[PDB]
Design an enzyme around this catalytic site. Structure first.
Site, PDB file in Angstrom:
ATOM      1  N   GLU A   1      -4.789   4.562 -10.640  1.00  0.00           N
ATOM      2  CA  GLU A   1      -5.631   3.382 -10.455  1.00  0.00           C
ATOM      3  C   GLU A   1      -6.802   3.384 -11.424  1.00  0.00           C
ATOM      4  OE1 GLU A   1      -6.192   1.877  -6.170  1.00  0.00           O
ATOM      5  OE2 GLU A   1      -5.774   4.018  -5.913  1.00  0.00           O
TER       6      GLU A   1
ATOM      7  N   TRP B   1      -9.094   6.957  -0.534  1.00  0.00           N
ATOM      8  CA  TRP B   1      -9.318   7.769  -1.722  1.00  0.00           C
ATOM      9  C   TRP B   1      -8.323   7.329  -2.800  1.00  0.00           C
ATOM     10  CZ3 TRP B   1      -7.800  10.041   2.953  1.00  0.00           C
ATOM     11  CH2 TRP B   1      -6.436  10.341   3.040  1.00  0.00           C
TER      12      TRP B   1
ATOM     13  N   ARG C   1      -0.042   4.448   2.931  1.00  0.00           N
ATOM     14  CA  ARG C   1       0.035   4.147   4.351  1.00  0.00           C
ATOM     15  C   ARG C   1       0.486   5.313   5.221  1.00  0.00           C
ATOM     16  NH1 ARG C   1       3.726  -0.786   4.805  1.00  0.00           N
ATOM     17  NH2 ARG C   1       4.346  -0.167   2.672  1.00  0.00           N
TER      18      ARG C   1
ATOM     19  N   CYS D   1       0.836  -1.194   0.000  1.00  0.00           N
ATOM     20  CA  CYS D   1       0.000   0.000   0.000  1.00  0.00           C
ATOM     21  C   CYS D   1       0.872   1.246   0.000  1.00  0.00           C
ATOM     22  CB  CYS D   1      -0.946   0.011   1.205  1.00  0.00           C
ATOM     23  SG  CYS D   1      -1.956   1.526   1.301  1.00  0.00           S
TER      24      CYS D   1
HETATM   25  C1  HEM Z   1      -6.000   6.785   1.770  1.00  0.00           C
HETATM   26  C2  HEM Z   1      -5.509   6.653   0.532  1.00  0.00           C
HETATM   27  C3  HEM Z   1      -5.049   5.288  -0.050  1.00  0.00           C
HETATM   28  C4  HEM Z   1      -4.363   5.167  -1.186  1.00  0.00           C
HETATM   29  C5  HEM Z   1      -3.907   6.343  -2.074  1.00  0.00           C
HETATM   30  C6  HEM Z   1      -4.123   3.763  -1.443  1.00  0.00           C
HETATM   31  C7  HEM Z   1      -3.439   3.243  -2.520  1.00  0.00           C
HETATM   32  C8  HEM Z   1      -3.189   1.913  -2.800  1.00  0.00           C
HETATM   33  C9  HEM Z   1      -2.680   1.371  -4.056  1.00  0.00           C
HETATM   34  C10 HEM Z   1      -2.337   2.191  -5.316  1.00  0.00           C
HETATM   35  C11 HEM Z   1      -2.578   0.043  -3.926  1.00  0.00           C
HETATM   36  C12 HEM Z   1      -2.077  -0.918  -5.039  1.00  0.00           C
HETATM   37  C13 HEM Z   1      -3.118  -1.995  -5.341  1.00  0.00           C
HETATM   38  C14 HEM Z   1      -3.787  -1.698  -6.658  1.00  0.00           C
HETATM   39  O1  HEM Z   1      -3.154  -1.015  -7.512  1.00  0.00           O
HETATM   40  O2  HEM Z   1      -4.950  -2.155  -6.840  1.00  0.00           O
HETATM   41  C15 HEM Z   1      -3.024  -0.303  -2.579  1.00  0.00           C
HETATM   42  C16 HEM Z   1      -3.067  -1.546  -1.994  1.00  0.00           C
HETATM   43  C17 HEM Z   1      -3.546  -1.804  -0.715  1.00  0.00           C
HETATM   44  N1  HEM Z   1      -4.136  -0.900   0.162  1.00  0.00           N
HETATM   45 FE1  HEM Z   1      -3.989   1.155   0.151  1.00  0.00          FE
HETATM   46  N2  HEM Z   1      -4.694   3.041  -0.419  1.00  0.00           N
HETATM   47  C18 HEM Z   1      -5.282   3.944   0.460  1.00  0.00           C
HETATM   48  C19 HEM Z   1      -5.975   3.589   1.608  1.00  0.00           C
HETATM   49  C20 HEM Z   1      -5.994   2.347   2.195  1.00  0.00           C
HETATM   50  C21 HEM Z   1      -6.678   1.993   3.429  1.00  0.00           C
HETATM   51  C22 HEM Z   1      -7.548   2.996   4.235  1.00  0.00           C
HETATM   52  C23 HEM Z   1      -6.446   0.690   3.660  1.00  0.00           C
HETATM   53  C24 HEM Z   1      -6.919  -0.189   4.843  1.00  0.00           C
HETATM   54  C25 HEM Z   1      -7.432   0.326   5.966  1.00  0.00           C
HETATM   55  C26 HEM Z   1      -5.576   0.201   2.599  1.00  0.00           C
HETATM   56  C27 HEM Z   1      -5.082  -1.079   2.441  1.00  0.00           C
HETATM   57  C28 HEM Z   1      -4.468  -1.601   1.318  1.00  0.00           C
HETATM   58  C29 HEM Z   1      -4.058  -2.988   1.146  1.00  0.00           C
HETATM   59  C30 HEM Z   1      -4.239  -4.108   2.202  1.00  0.00           C
HETATM   60  C31 HEM Z   1      -3.517  -3.101  -0.078  1.00  0.00           C
HETATM   61  C32 HEM Z   1      -2.906  -4.345  -0.755  1.00  0.00           C
HETATM   62  C33 HEM Z   1      -3.805  -5.556  -0.983  1.00  0.00           C
HETATM   63  C34 HEM Z   1      -2.886  -6.711  -1.356  1.00  0.00           C
HETATM   64  O3  HEM Z   1      -2.173  -7.247  -0.457  1.00  0.00           O
HETATM   65  O4  HEM Z   1      -2.860  -7.092  -2.558  1.00  0.00           O
HETATM   66  N3  HEM Z   1      -5.345   1.235   1.740  1.00  0.00           N
HETATM   67  N4  HEM Z   1      -3.376   0.864  -1.932  1.00  0.00           N
HETATM   68  C1  LIG Z   2      -8.886   1.496   0.254  1.00  0.00           C
HETATM   69  C2  LIG Z   2      -8.291   1.667  -1.130  1.00  0.00           C
HETATM   70  C3  LIG Z   2      -7.751   2.884  -1.534  1.00  0.00           C
HETATM   71  C4  LIG Z   2      -7.219   3.000  -2.826  1.00  0.00           C
HETATM   72  N1  LIG Z   2      -6.680   4.173  -3.248  1.00  0.00           N
HETATM   73  N2  LIG Z   2      -7.239   1.947  -3.676  1.00  0.00           N
HETATM   74  C5  LIG Z   2      -7.770   0.757  -3.297  1.00  0.00           C
HETATM   75  C6  LIG Z   2      -7.798  -0.407  -4.265  1.00  0.00           C
HETATM   76  C7  LIG Z   2      -6.461  -1.120  -4.212  1.00  0.00           C
HETATM   77  C8  LIG Z   2      -6.666  -2.502  -3.648  1.00  0.00           C
HETATM   78  C9  LIG Z   2      -6.426  -2.691  -2.295  1.00  0.00           C
HETATM   79  C10 LIG Z   2      -6.609  -3.950  -1.731  1.00  0.00           C
HETATM   80  F1  LIG Z   2      -6.377  -4.140  -0.417  1.00  0.00           F
HETATM   81  C11 LIG Z   2      -7.030  -5.015  -2.518  1.00  0.00           C
HETATM   82  C12 LIG Z   2      -7.267  -4.831  -3.875  1.00  0.00           C
HETATM   83  C13 LIG Z   2      -7.731  -6.022  -4.682  1.00  0.00           C
HETATM   84  C14 LIG Z   2      -7.461  -5.847  -6.170  1.00  0.00           C
HETATM   85  C15 LIG Z   2      -6.569  -6.979  -6.681  1.00  0.00           C
HETATM   86  C16 LIG Z   2      -7.197  -8.342  -6.413  1.00  0.00           C
HETATM   87  C17 LIG Z   2      -6.916  -9.169  -7.657  1.00  0.00           C
HETATM   88  C18 LIG Z   2      -6.700  -8.153  -8.774  1.00  0.00           C
HETATM   89  N3  LIG Z   2      -6.344  -6.873  -8.135  1.00  0.00           N
HETATM   90  C19 LIG Z   2      -4.922  -6.618  -8.369  1.00  0.00           C
HETATM   91  C20 LIG Z   2      -7.089  -3.571  -4.445  1.00  0.00           C
HETATM   92  C21 LIG Z   2      -8.303   0.596  -2.015  1.00  0.00           C
END
Ligand code: HEM
Ligand SMILES: Cc1cc(N)nc(CCc2cc(F)cc(CC[C@H]3CCCN3C)c2)c1
Ligand code: HEM
Ligand SMILES: Cc1cc(N)nc(CCc2cc(F)cc(CC[C@H]3CCCN3C)c2)c1
Ligand SMILES: C[C@H](O)[C@H](O)[C@H]1CNc2nc(N)[nH]c(=O)c2N1
Ligand SMILES: C[C@H](O)[C@H](O)[C@H]1CNc2nc(N)[nH]c(=O)c2N1
Ligand SMILES: [Zn+2]
Lengths: 411, 407
Positions: B283, B278, B109, B106
């Site tokens: 994305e 947000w 964070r 993430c």
């Molecule tokens: C507040 C602004 C946030 C931004 C800009 C952000 C951004 C991102 C991005 C770009 C990814 C890459 C995954 C993808 O491209 O689909 C990601 C993954 C992830 N985000 Fe953040 N996120 C935010 C908030 C949060 C919050 C609030 C949580 C949990 C409370 C969270 C938990 C996660 C987790 C667990 C993953 C990875 C899932 C995995 O293991 O594949 N995010 N996030």
């Molecule tokens: C809270 C939040 C903020 C933000 N800015 N963006 C996101 C979306 C990113 C994301 C977070 C996550 F914990 C799990 C996945 C699953 C998507 C995977 C599963 C299989 C194919 N995809 C790669 C996406 C979430």
């Protein structure tokens, strides 16, 4: 044991058995991954096992495993090691070794070409002047008036570590970098340290922004020596843009031949510390990294200025916009001058085809995702969506320390 | 074994001691790196509780206190008796914030400590789940001034009583297969859009149809619920230079809210824990719009830009891809909906790493996911070495419900 990788764009799945032949280590453990870490005197004790593994591979590839030519060669290598402490590769074995070192190079996206490598055997070379001559001939052959051909030149192997052959340049052709007194940098900031060594060793620097550096060459462990590559051998491309006429006024140019010269080639337990190799450029290497890295020429500012972009907030993506124009200009200039180059879409698609073929006919293809994905427009290339297994096979190319940090100076 | 990570753009070097706390396994070995692979009883439970409670009481500077030992024995007794235990509200909040803190993939964070935790452990039905989710969505959306939030539903008991949100995200667009061949709407959701109709939904069969919610309380059959439109903030996508951009008819939703992950705290499994924040601009614009397996609008855009699409070497895909992403940012910012560009978010994350190494000893990070899907090397994270390792509490993937549910 078998392992599967999945392409999440096409759902194509592949099965890797080749990682089983992996001996060397990766850097990772079950509890930590070093996948993004850039970088994570050999006696007869371990040398024959390393020779044997290599020759088993070699005779397998030529469908002669267990033949009398195979057993005799093992025996011949054995007695040569026990009596002389090292051994010599046959010409066939050296060529095989160099190709497979490239084939095994998990960070290299251009590996579809691995079997078409011109190997120059420079193991008879004894002096720095002799090295300059071999390198000049490599450059002429590889450049081929812009129709580039892959090549490697292999200088004598290490013996006791005190008689190494070394090319002190990181690449055969590179631009000088000069630290100014006011803090600014003229030329290529990546080369400021090497440039200073050359000047100290007696190079008369023109002190321009695109000065080809001299060759600094070390034979048989002696002090390195300076030679200037004849300018007519150094092919250069002026950078212009197909629509922006002010682009040529930036005065940019780049050289045509990427030729890595500071890596170690390992074959059958033998170490070749000087083994320059070259191919042709993927455009992003010049356009994204060489020009636009904050720690390189960094022309993003001046380009965006002349494009008259909203440069106040980064959310205007003026940096991303300037970068695409620069990479268009690099590809256009090279293609216009008929100097071989490949764009990052072509190269990545090719690597995917290469990789699928490697899984079918070889059982795997070691690949370093962190390095294979291009440094711009990552997810619109098919490798971004491609799961990859990274492991280290031999023959291999390895890093080695810069010689100026280890060398014992004669004076 | 007290590791170092270099930034190659700045020569800054940080020493990681936090990785030595890592418990779970990465998938790699000494012989193979899987860093690019997408997905690899009463007795086990008490050590998990102790480890969590120990780090909890240290964070509040009460390690080895009466309070500590008392809570330790207290939970120890509840496990031997009930074969599980319940977190105090304060531990639940801490547990959730730190599952985010530890999420090595993430980039967002840096905001980890400013998370709104909604305790929904008193919930018993899908109608109640829906009420909680609506309140989450409204709170998190905040008229476009988005706020981080998580809502936590009852913990797993025996795996037969699981609470599950069947949607992958709370808000996502429908995906319909066409008789003539390709796909209308969002291809990533075609099977889910199927199971909605195949469970009763009435699809408008448009390109941007907000999917209904499919909620499962106590391992019962799931139920369809339409999120009130007034709660679903959407942004029409236009370009600040190209007036024809509006005619493409593109929009996206403001709230990214992941709903299919499993939240693990002190050995307890929360299988329904929708969380939201947000968007980062890329994305939507790089992945959602331009992935060949998604909306794949690239050709239509470059066509409208009249770029030379004859050879890949003209970089028309790259050039389109930028304009699309400039627009997504422009649209969100113009409607005053929170969004962050990939340059700001990655620089923030470098700052956040610098803090984590400084005040915690490290920060697990997955370069393959932290680096943005465009313009990677002009962002500071590209030159940042990162160590990836699993800390707990954590968010984990979990099987899709319809494969599992005893229907
Ligand atoms: C507040 C602004 C946030 C931004 C800009 C952000 C951004 C991102 C991005 C770009 C990814 C890459 C995954 C993808 O491209 O689909 C990601 C993954 C992830 N985000 Fe953040 N996120 C935010 C908030 C949060 C919050 C609030 C949580 C949990 C409370 C969270 C938990 C996660 C987790 C667990 C993953 C990875 C899932 C995995 O293991 O594949 N995010 N996030
Ligand atoms: C809270 C939040 C903020 C933000 N800015 N963006 C996101 C979306 C990113 C994301 C977070 C996550 F914990 C799990 C996945 C699953 C998507 C995977 C599963 C299989 C194919 N995809 C790669 C996406 C979430
Ligand atoms: C023919 C066209 C070729 C292309 C387009 C190409 C492209 C690349 C690129 C983009 C990289 C990433 C490194 C970086 O970005 O700095 C790389 C790495 C590498 N290439 Fe290739 N290459 C080519 C030919 C060759 C040849 C002929 C050899 C050796 C015989 C070779 C060996 C390697 C090795 C060993 C690496 C890894 C560097 C490392 O481990 O840090 N390549 N290549
Ligand atoms: C044959 C060839 C073709 C091509 N198209 N490009 C290249 C250059 C890529 C390369 C290959 C390599 F074996 C070693 C390095 C070291 C450079 C690293 C170390 C520190 C700064 N760089 C990250 C680069 C070579
Ligand atoms: C094959 C590869 O692991 C896969 O495409 C990953 C790569 N990195 C990613 N990074 C982000 N942020 N999101 C993703 O979905 C992926 N997908
Ligand atoms: C820290 C990180 O490993 C480093 O910046 C790497 C990332 N990926 C790369 N990929 C390529 N092709 N070339 C590089 O120099 C790098 N640098
Ligand atoms: Zn790894």
């Amino acid at each position: 044991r078998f392992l599967k990788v999945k392409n999440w764009e096409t759902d194509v799945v592949l099965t890797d058995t080749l990682h089983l032949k992996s001996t060397l280590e990766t850097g990772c453990t079950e509890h930590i991954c070093m996948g993004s870490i850039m970088l994570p005197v050999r006696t007869k004790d371990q040398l024959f096992p390393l020779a044997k593994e290599f020759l088993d591979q070699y005779y397998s590839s030529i469908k002669r495993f267990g033949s009398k030519a195979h057993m005799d060669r093992l025996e011949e290598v054995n007695k040569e090691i026990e009596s002389t402490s090292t051994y010599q590769l046959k010409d066939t074995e050296l060529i095989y070794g160099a190709k497979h070192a490239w084939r095994n190079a998990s960070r290299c996206v251009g590996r579809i070409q691995w079997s078409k490598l011109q190997v120059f055997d420079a193991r008879d070379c004894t002096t720095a002047h002799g090295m300059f001559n071999y390198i000049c001939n490599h450059v002429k052959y590889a450049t081929n008036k812009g129709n580039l051909r892959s090549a490697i030149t292999i200088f004598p192997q290490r013996t006791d570590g005190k008689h190494d052959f070394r090319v002190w340049n990181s690449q055969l052709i590179r631009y000088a970098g000069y630290k100014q007194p006011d803090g600014s940098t003229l030329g290529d900031p990546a080369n400021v340290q090497f440039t200073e060594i050359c000047i100290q060793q007696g190079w008369k620097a023109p002190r321009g922004r695109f000065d080809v550096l001299p060759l600094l060459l070390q034979a048989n462990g002696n002090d390195p020596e300076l030679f200037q590559i004849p300018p007519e051998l150094v092919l250069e491309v002026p950078i212009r843009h197909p629509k922006f006429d002010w682009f040529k006024d930036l005065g940019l140019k780049w050289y045509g031949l990427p030729a890595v010269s500071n890596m170690l080639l390992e074959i059958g337990g033998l170490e070749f510390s000087a083994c320059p190799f070259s191919g042709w450029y993927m455009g992003t290497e010049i356009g994204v990294r060489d020009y636009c890295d904050n720690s390189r020429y960094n022309i993003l500012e001046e380009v965006a200025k002349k494009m008259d972009l909203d440069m106040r907030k980064t959310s205007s993506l003026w940096k991303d916009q300037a970068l695409v124009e620069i990479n268009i200009a690099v590809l256009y200039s090279f293609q216009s001058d008929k100097v071989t180059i490949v764009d990052h879409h072509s190269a990545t698609e090719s690597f995917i085809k290469h990789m699928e073929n490697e899984y079918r006919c070889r059982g795997g293809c070691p690949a370093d995702w962190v390095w294979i994905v291009p440094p711009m427009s990552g997810s619109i290339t098919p490798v971004f969506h491609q799961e990859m297994l990274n492991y280290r096979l031999t023959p291999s190319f390895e890093y080695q320390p810069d010689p100026w940090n280890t060398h014992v100076w004669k004076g």
